[PDB]
Paper text:
Among these diverse flagellar proteins, flagellin is a major component of the flagellum that forms the flagellar filament. In the flagellin filament, the D0 and D1 domains mediate inter-molecular and inter-domain interactions and form the helical stem of the filament. In addition to the native function in bacteria as a structural unit of the flagellar filament, flagellin stimulates innate immunity in the host by directly interacting with Toll-like receptor 5 (TLR5), an innate immune receptor. In this study, Bacillus cereus flagellin (BcFlg) was identified as the smallest flagellin consisting only of the D0 and D1 domains that still activated innate immunity as a TLR5 agonist.
To provide a schematic plan for insertional fusion sites, the crystal structure of BcFlg protein was determined at 1.85 Å resolution. The structure contains BcFlg residues 54–229 corresponding to the D1 domain, which was shown to directly interact with TLR5 in a previously reported SdFlg-zfTLR5 structure. The BcFlg structure presents a topology of S1 (residues 54–56) - S2 (residues 59–61) - H1 (residues 63–98) - H2 (residues 104–127) - S3 (residues 147–150) - S4 (residues 158–161) - H3 (residues 166–169) - H3a (residues 171–173) - H4 (residues 180–216) - H5 (residues 221–226). The H1, H2, H4, and H5 helices are α-helices, and the H3 and H3a helices adopt 310 helical structures. BcFlg is structurally similar to its orthologs (PaFlg, SsFlg, SdFlg, and StFlg) in that it contains a three-helix bundle structure (H1, H2, and H4) appended to an S3-S4 β-hairpin. In contrast to the common fold, the BcFlg structure is distinguishable from other flagellin structures in forming unique conformations at the N-terminal and C-terminal regions. BcFlg residues 54–61 that correspond to the N-terminal region of the D1 domain fold into two β-strands, S1 and S2, and their connecting loop. In contrast, in the BcFlg structure, the C-terminal helix in the D1 domain is split into two α-helices, H4 and H5, which are distanced by 11.3 Å and angled by 72.9°. In the SdFlg-zfTLR5 complex structure, the C-terminal region of SdFlg D1 is also discontinued to two α-helices as for the BcFlg structure but with a different distance (16.9 Å) and angle (13.8°). These observations suggest that the C-terminal region of the D1 domain is a pliable helix that can bend and adopt diverse conformations. Because the residues 181–185 form an α helix, an insertional site was selected in BcFlg residues 178–180 (middle fusion, mF) so as not to interrupt the secondary structural fold.
Residue numbers in the entry: 54 to 229
The structure:
């Protein structure tokens, strides 16, 4: 159901929780790919690879970059590609009205996953480039960890709202 355009009620909250689980799992896949990319970059920066091995590491690394972009574009809730605000059509925020909470609204914010990950990365075409990729990969791993933390926290918050669960944090926030 809606109330002045805004989405309300238990089933709507469940839908949003489903979007959050989808987003977290997709960002989890992206994080695991970034870890594999970090391993490849570390190997390639090492100094010790010939022409063929340099090429094979670079090929796999670039394939993994493309896989991140694929996941970023394909992930959706009901056709909304919320991990890619640069898509056509762009991912958009999802608004969720909380129940018995004085009209509080949660926004699942759509993000630019590519900008946080592949937009900052290049390739392993040479040893020197591979070395500088490592730092960039560590940065991207941390950014993705924050984005997943956001979705995880929002999921907990919706779970408490939908399931009428009160915790220490609820009791603390009651006065405000």
């Amino acid at each position: 159901a809606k109330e002045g355009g805004l989405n309300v009620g238990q089933r709507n909250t469940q839908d949003a929780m489903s979007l959050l689980r989808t987003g977290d799992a997709a960002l989890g896949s992206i994080s695991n790919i970034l870890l594999r990319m970090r391993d490849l970059a570390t190997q390639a920066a090492n100094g010790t690879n010939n022409a063929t091995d340099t090429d094979s590491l670079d090929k796999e690394y670039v394939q993994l970059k493309d896989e991140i972009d694929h996941i970023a574009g394909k992930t959706n809730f009901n056709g909304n590609s919320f991990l890619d605000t640069t898509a056509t059509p762009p991912g958009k925020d999802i608004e969720i009205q909380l129940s018995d909470a004085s009209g509080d609204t949660m926004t699942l914010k759509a993000i630019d996953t590519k900008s946080l990950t592949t937009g900052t990365l290049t390739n392993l075409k040479d040893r020197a480039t591979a070395e500088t990729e490592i730092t960039k990969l560590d940065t991207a791993i941390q950014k993705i960890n924050d984005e997943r933390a956001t979705f995880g926290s929002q999921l907990n918050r919706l779970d408490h709202n939908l399931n009428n669960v009160t915790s220490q944090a609820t009791n603390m926030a009651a006065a405000a």
